[PDB]
Ligand binder design. Structure first.
Ligand SMILES: [Cl-]
Ligand SMILES: [Cl-]
Length: 214
C-alpha cells in the first residue's frame, strides 16, 4: 500500500500550501483525493482570506497545536457550505472523511470538530507529539509502515475521530516552536501566534477529471 504522508514529495494528485505564521512558515501537502471535503473547505477558506489574522489559540507541547477559529477560543468557525448546501453541512459542519491511508502521525493536519458527527467547520490542528507509543498499536488495524511511522510520534487515539487531510513537509521546527510558546492556564499563547497569510503553491481544481499515472 502507498501511504502518501510518508513522502515529502508533492504527488501530481496532491495540493501544497504554506502557512505564513508570525513564528515562521509551515509547508503542508494536502490529500484532495482522500479527504475532498476537508481539502476544498480549507483551500477555499484560505483563498477567501478566512484564516488571515487567525491565531493558534491552543498549544500543548507533546500533543498538538490548534487554530482555524475566527473567535480565538475554540468555539467558532463554519464550513464553506454552512447555510448554502445541506447535502454537505446540515448546520454544525461537514462529515468526517476517515480513510485507512491517512493517520494522526506527527506532522498530520486534521480537522478538530466537537467529537460528534458532522461537526467539521474551519478549525484544524497539527499533530506535534514526538513520543514512540507504537508498541500499543493493534497490528490488525495499523499497517506495518504506519506503525513504523508512529515511532517518530503521533496521537493514534485521534484516528477515526479526526479526519486527516494534510501533512507538514517543511517547517515542523516552526510547529514545535509554536507548541512550546509561553501560554496561560487555558493553553493560549501569551503573545499571539498568527497566520498572516496562506500561500497556495499548488492548487487543486475539484472539477478536474484528469487521470494521473500512479
Ligand atoms: Cl513521516
Ligand atoms: Cl461525521
Amino acid at each position: 500500500m502507498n501511504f502518501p504522508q510518508l513522502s515529502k514529495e508533492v504527488a501530481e494528485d496532491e495540493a501544497e500550501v504554506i502557512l505564513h505564521t508570525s513564528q515562521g512558515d509551515i509547508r503542508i501537502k494536502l490529500f484532495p483525493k482522500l479527504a475532498p471535503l476537508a481539502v476544498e473547505n480549507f483551500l477555499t477558506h484560505a483563498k477567501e482570506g478566512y484564516y488571515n489574522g487567525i491565531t493558534f489559540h491552543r498549544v500543548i507541547d507533546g500533543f498538538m497545536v490548534q487554530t482555524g477559529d475566527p473567535k480565538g477560543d475554540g468555539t467558532g468557525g463554519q464550513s464553506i457550505w454552512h447555510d448554502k448546501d445541506k447535502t454537505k453541512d446540515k448546520g454544525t459542519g461537514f462529515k468526517n472523511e476517515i480513510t485507512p491511508y491517512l493517520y494522526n502521525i506527527r506532522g498530520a493536519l486534521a480537522m478538530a470538530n466537537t467529537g460528534q458527527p458532522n461537526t467539521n467547520g474551519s478549525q484544524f490542528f497539527i499533530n506535534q507529539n514526538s513520543t514512540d507509543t507504537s508498541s500499543k498499536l493493534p497490528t490488525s488495524k495499523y499497517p506495518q509502515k504506519i506503525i513504523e511511522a508512529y515511532k517518530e510520534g503521533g496521537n493514534p487515539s485521534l484516528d477515526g475521530k479526526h479526519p486527516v487531510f494534510g501533512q507538514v513537509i517543511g517547517g515542523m521546527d516552526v510547529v514545535d516552536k509554536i507548541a512550546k510558546a509561553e501560554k496561560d492556564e487555558k493553553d493560549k499563547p501569551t503573545t499571539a501566534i498568527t497566520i498572516d497569510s496562506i500561500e497556495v503553491v499548488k492548487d487543486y481544481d475539484f472539477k478536474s477529471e484528469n487521470l494521473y499515472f500512479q
